[PDB]
Design a protein around this ligand. Sequence first.
Ligand SMILES: [Zn+2]
Ligand SMILES: [Zn+2]
Lengths: 145, 212, 127, 102, 357, 240, 39, 35, 89
Amino acid sequence: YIGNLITRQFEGRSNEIVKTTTKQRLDAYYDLELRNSVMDDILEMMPESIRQKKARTILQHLSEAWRCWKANIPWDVPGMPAPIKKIIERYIKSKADAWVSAAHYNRERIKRGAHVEKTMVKKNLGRLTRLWIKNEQERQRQIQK
Amino acid sequence: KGGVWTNVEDQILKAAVQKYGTHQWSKVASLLQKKTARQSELRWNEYLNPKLNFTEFSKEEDAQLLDLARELPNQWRTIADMMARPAQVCVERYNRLLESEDSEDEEKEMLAEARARLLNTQGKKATRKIRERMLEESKRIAELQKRRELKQAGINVAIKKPKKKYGTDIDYNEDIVYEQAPMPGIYDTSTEDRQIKKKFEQFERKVNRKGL
Amino acid sequence: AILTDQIAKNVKLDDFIPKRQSNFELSVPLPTKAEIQECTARTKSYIQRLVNAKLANSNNRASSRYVAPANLLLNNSHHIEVVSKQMDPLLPRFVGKKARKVVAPTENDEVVPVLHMDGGEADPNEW
Amino acid sequence: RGGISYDQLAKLSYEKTLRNLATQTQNSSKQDKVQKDTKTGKITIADDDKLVNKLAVSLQSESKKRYEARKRQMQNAKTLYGVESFINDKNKQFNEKLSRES
Amino acid sequence: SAFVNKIFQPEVAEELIVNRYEKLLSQRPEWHAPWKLSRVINGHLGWVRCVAIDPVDNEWFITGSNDTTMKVWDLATGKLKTTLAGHVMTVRDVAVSDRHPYLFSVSEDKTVKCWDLEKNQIIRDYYGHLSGVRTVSIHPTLDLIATAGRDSVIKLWDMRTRIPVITLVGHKGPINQVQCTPVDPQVVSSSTDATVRLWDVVAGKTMKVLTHHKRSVRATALHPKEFSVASACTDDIRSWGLAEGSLLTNFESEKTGIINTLSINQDDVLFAGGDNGVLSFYDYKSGHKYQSLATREMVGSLEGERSVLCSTFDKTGLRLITGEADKSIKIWKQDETATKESEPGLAWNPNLSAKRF
Amino acid sequence: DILDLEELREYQRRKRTEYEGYLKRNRLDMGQWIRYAQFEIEQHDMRRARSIFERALLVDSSFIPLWIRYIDAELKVKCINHARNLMNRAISTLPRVDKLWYKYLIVEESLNNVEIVRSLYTKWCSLEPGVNAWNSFVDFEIRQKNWNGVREIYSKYVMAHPQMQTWLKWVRFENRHGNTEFTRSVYSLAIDTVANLQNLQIWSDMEVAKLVNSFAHWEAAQQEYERSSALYQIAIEKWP
Amino acid sequence: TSHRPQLEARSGAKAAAYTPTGIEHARLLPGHTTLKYRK
Amino acid sequence: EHPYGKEVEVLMETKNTQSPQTPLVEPVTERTKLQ
Amino acid sequence: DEINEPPPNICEQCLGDEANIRMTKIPQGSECKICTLPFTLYHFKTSKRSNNIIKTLICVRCATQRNICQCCMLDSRWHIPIQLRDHLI
Ligand SMILES: [Zn+2]
Ligand SMILES: [Zn+2]
């Protein structure tokens, strides 16, 4: 402890500090992955000659589409190049599986009562009331079909 | 206290949804005094939505309505999605179709507040950045004319450099910053370097005398 | 044809063309057993000299557990005996060592040609 | 229809500069080497002082024409459309972009 | 003969567009038996992102996934041995060592983790990646690991002392695939700057830069014999000859789009997993597609999910294991009782219009 | 406005501190690089003004407008040898981009250095680039009146692009000039090449009909109907 | 503004030219000092 | 209902067959110990 | 490269007349006068009974780029200062 302290006094602290992932920045890093994978699979299917300008637009389509999945809006972009619609539906189903599994995983953890945060109880109430109304809206639709 | 909708408040709400979106209803009720974000949401989803269907009744619609209201008795939110129409209009016509068998003084200030709020998009951070940028240039313009007025007296006072924030802060003016020289080529740029240097020293001689 | 070579010397046509297209049975041999050992023994000696540099420079005393007097200076006139100073174990070793940040210049002597192929390209206005 | 690919547009703008260069030579008609170094590998090309000026003036003048063409296009773009409500120039600019998408 | 060299006098007599085409008609590709589906394994709660096989023997393969786990599957029966937790985020590469019983696994939680395969617990672990890592390649005969990820630098780890010994700095984008070879050039890397670099880890700099791909070089794979690597961008697969960096051959990869994975058999069956779900088998020597196949997605799943994400052959070479984005594992099996007749595959028909050759 | 050099010297510091701050946080955004590079041209300091483009090329060397602007920046200040070295690096880095090849041309066109574009064209057509290049190269020698040189080009151009619209482009060249002795020699070479390279299957049935007809209608204009008739029987027997 | 997505990740090229610190971390202490080899 | 050519077997695996403390590689013992 | 480093560039008149000179190496001694970055400080004495330690003030890279010794910073050939050298050329 004191060997680190005095060498920090005599040399400063390191510029190369890299932050490992923890519980607080888990969903934030899961975003930065999910942005980059959709960046690659769409920048590989473009014709040729654009990199920086479509990245703004096409990831805002993802963020809008992820909101529409969370809201059970069907997310119809009117004229959309159908391979890109295949991509954005694919990763949002991928993010759906992580989002739904963490909702089941934390709900079993709360019922056991084994060290859940005060915030995570409200976050899990939010995710399950999304999923209960989705199950309700699905049940209304297949009754009407 | 449950008020009626004036056509003034009707135009604020349409301009509100046009900027804020259909989900930010408490943003809408902030512009809209006396009205609720529930009430704001309710009118846009029952009256003001231009997707809605306020028109005449074809006989197909009237035969479809009397079918649905017989098959789905009293399910008007259900029938109005089948008819793709608003619901209380759908009830109003079903009331009428069965009758066939017969035997600024204040508002403008609200509008002036709403007109200013919709046209101001920045927040604290951008407006403060604007203000600090104007005040920084005002300090700069003051300091330059100081040196000119002292130069009117003949006494020369140099411009002070900005203070270093951190240790290795770079004076970009002092040197070629990160001098990436071009790759050494074959076509012998020897006379061309002499003519830029002669032109660049000529340009510095003109700024001392005529001043750009 | 006064300067035939000096245009784009680093690119040729031979770099574009495949080599298995002349014969599908061209032999590219696996590396021989005498050749992998000359490369393993050079690399293992270089990496072990790097791990010993990392451990001996760390201030942990428990790092020597896991691990030259001669260079003619000018020429022919001076033979120099190079020794090490027995440092005070309380004053910090590596006195000129601080956590400072440097930006590095990129040394480029040659341009790598970006050897794509082709000029389809028809755009259906879509995308 | 379609757009023009960057090979064809490179060729067409190449031809336009050839036609303009030919009309400069025609107008100049109406109005009337390589040494390599021994010490270094550096190469020296004897040039007239004219046609270097003429190239530099042409590139500046083409830049002026395109600058003022876009500037006049800026003037038209902010004077034509006034139907939709906006907040700034960038609102009308972006809503011209949504009109182009239709 | 080919009169061309009598009339059209050339300066090389190989660099004409016809002379090359005449030779290429003359040779024939080796016939390879077609492949068919054998077994479909489900089980993961997310996608499958990486599959590695056991080097010594063939009982098991480990299937690094998108539900952050790693499941161990028996190759023979298809059953599930055990599950390896210990990554908070999804697993991007898995590599098993032949020399010693360690499974190196890596994720995009910026962690490189060893596993004792005698004890099934995490060993050491590695630290130093600025961003989420995508590749592990275990060096044979030196006890190193090459890991690379979004940092654009390859970190050469020592196994014993947990020190990132050499760091390789050449790239301009995230690095997608890294392979370790036993002689110079020791590390073969592929990143999204459309380059493949041949490294010199003693000098710590690039021997050879390969800029032939148009786009992100997403997958490479080493040939178990013949000392060559094959690299795949979005639509062209190029077999590279190491120790020269020479372009051996250009495959008929055209019309494939985003090839996720590559695998090379001992029999020169090359695999190219498609993001469209179309998986194509190429003869490695000639570069000829001889089979193209499309999978089924699932009972109910999305139409974009039909895509192959990762692949390997076993030690024998008669099994192809593909982990796909439909949350499943498919085991592809080379079809016996198929003679040259009955199934020659696709016809050896080149065109000079596509100038690939 | 700036009155003396010291007010200029403070003016340059505040902008360079501004632009380098946005370029430090955004290594990308090539438009920001050029506008700060354009600023140093307005300050007439070309040594700095080269360096921002060189630093911008180390970020993204595949961005073509960055190449064209820095080429044009050396041209506008009359530094032609700085542009010749730079254009050499532009084509040697990116040989596929046609614009970098055409940019080297029209400058050497504008200097009337005809031997240098010819040496450019010989190298650029050695890399087998495409039909847009050779067509601009046969259009160059028409401008230079070198009729022996342009005949040598089509000799190579059919051997870069073996297809009838390259052969028939060489016959529209010769029939534009009326040299009958050369024209049928082109015709003889075109039809023999289809015959001897028959097994290669690189000219389709519609493609070879155009050669036989454009051979035959030419001979009818040369008043020799018996040769124009005789080749029809040979072509139908060679291709039934 | 002030709340941005990444255009690129932090590259390891810049951290390679810096000078090291030699601070002693808890997880870089010597542990599992012996490799086990397969038969 | 037959999700593949019906030659292909579909198996849904939810639990681990062998225990986690099963070694997964045999530990190499060169000398037999009776301790 | 911290394990492969050039020998120091020092003058003949810095080393003096004697044959064997005992030099002390410190692997990260002082930082450079010019580049402000650390290096291997060599220091030595001309004779054994001297009273002046002759240190290397600049690193080998700054001594290479100027072609000067590390101790007295004179040019390695001609033994003249840098300002007089660049004026003679
Ligand atoms: Zn120095
Ligand atoms: Zn000296």
